[PDB]
């Protein structure tokens, strides 16, 4: 219960404000078409998993 | 099988080696449209200065310019009448799709 | 006599290295013109043409 | 007038994937495609290897 | 059942004074990757350099 509370508090006080990070803009010809269909010009260098 | 490969991008090394094996054994014809390339046209005396293994053709990144070389064998003088017969056979894998 | 092949390439002397152009492979090429942003462009990129 | 926000660049989620591999079937060695597509597809490919 | 094709502006207009180019520019643009605006700026700075 204490853990759910600290999660809730840590979310209630998540005063983060995203600024644009390092971001690639790959030349389109280098990307396999399946990736090109997904990508929209730029993307963060720190693409996460998905 | 006239297999057309529009894009090699996700293709596994296993599958690529296997497709090449099918080209050699089942006599597949595998057109590969992904590749962009330049073509120096060699003359028989200058030989083939550069080389391209099938592995590299199946695994080179898209958007890189491949530099293939193609011999014009037209200026190859006839063999001496007394040269020993060739028991073997010269072969070839890479061809252009276009002039 | 004995000329294997005659070609009609672009004049490398005119489109010099001063223009950033290479012509060793038959096509014109120019580096760092059309490039990815945030990463180094790969070598021998087709976009160079 | 206020220090209301902590500015940050590459935000981390509350959730995240976790994955236990079967060591017998996993090649610990990294997978990779072309540099272009490994830049994107990459970490996803390695997580769900 | 159609046939897509480029059609030069000169074939439509009769006034030559306002027609500077041809099909060839469109064909060249068809050769180009789609460019993000920063890539366009990069190209312009390159040519300038």
Curated annotation (Swiss-Prot), chain A:
Cellular compartment(s): Virion
Family classification: Belongs to the turreted BTV-fold inner capsid family.
Role, per record: Inner capsid protein that self-assembles to form an icosahedral capsid with a T=2 symmetry, which consists of 120 copies of VP2, with channels at each of its five-fold vertices. This capsid constitutes the innermost concentric layer of the viral mature particle.
Subunit architecture: Homodecamer; each decamer is made up of two conformers of VP2, called VP2A and VP2B. 12 homodecamers assemble to form an icosahedral capsid.
Name under which the protein is recorded: Inner capsid protein VP1
Organism: Bombyx mori cytoplasmic polyhedrosis virus (BmCPV)
């Amino acid at each position: 219960v204490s853990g759910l509370l600290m999660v809730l508090f840590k979310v209630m006080t998540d005063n983060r404000l995203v600024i644009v990070g390092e971001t690639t803009t790959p030349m389109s010809n280098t990307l396999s078409t399946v990736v090109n269909n997904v990508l929209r010009t730029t993307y963060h260098n720190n693409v996460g998993v998905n | 099988v006239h297999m057309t490969i529009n894009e090699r991008a996700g293709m596994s090394k296993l599958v690529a080696d296997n497709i090449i094996a099918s080209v050699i054994k089942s006599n597949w014809v595998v057109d590969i449209l992904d590749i962009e390339y330049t073509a120096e046209v060699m003359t028989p005396s200058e030989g083939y200065t550069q080389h391209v293994d099938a592995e590299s053709i199946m695994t080179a990144p898209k958007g890189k310019l491949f530099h293939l070389q193609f011999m014009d064998g037209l200026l190859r003088p006839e063999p001496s009448a007394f040269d020993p017969p060739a028991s073997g056979e010269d072969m070839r894998l890479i061809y252009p799709l276009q002039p | 006599y004995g000329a294997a092949v005659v070609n009609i390439d672009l004049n490398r002397d005119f489109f010099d290295t001063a223009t950033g152009i290479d012509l060793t492979k038959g096509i014109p090429l120019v580096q760092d013109l059309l490039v990815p942003i945030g990463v180094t462009a790969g070598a021998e990129q087709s976009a160079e043409y | 007038l206020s220090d209301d926000f902590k500015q940050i660049s590459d935000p981390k989620g509350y959730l995240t994937y976790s994955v236990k591999y079967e060591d017998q079937f996993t090649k610990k060695d990294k997978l990779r495609a072309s540099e272009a597509d490994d830049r994107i597809v990459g970490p996803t490919v390695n997580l769900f290897k | 059942r159609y046939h897509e094709s480029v059609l030069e502006i000169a074939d439509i207009f009769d006034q030559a004074d306002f027609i500077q180019t041809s099909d060839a520019v469109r064909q060249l643009r068809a050769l180009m990757p789609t460019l993000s605006t920063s890539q366009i700026r990069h190209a312009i700075e390159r040519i300038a350099q």
